[PDB]
């Protein structure tokens, strides 16, 4: 299994269509929420892929 994970929101980032980080709001929302897994995802690919 595993539903909900970082790989999958940032997969729409890095290569994949709009998961967790990619949805309507949600998109770079992710992080600036208040869950974990949502706070990687922009925080892990928003961050890196906008410094870099």
Do not use: M
Request: charged share 35%.
């Amino acid at each position: 299994g595993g539903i909900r994970k970082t790989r999958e929101t940032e997969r729409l980032r890095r290569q994949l269509l709009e998961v967790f980080w990619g949805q309507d709001h949600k998109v770079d929302f992710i992080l600036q929420r208040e869950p974990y897994c949502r706070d990687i995802n922009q925080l892990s690919e928003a961050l890196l892929s906008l410094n870099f």
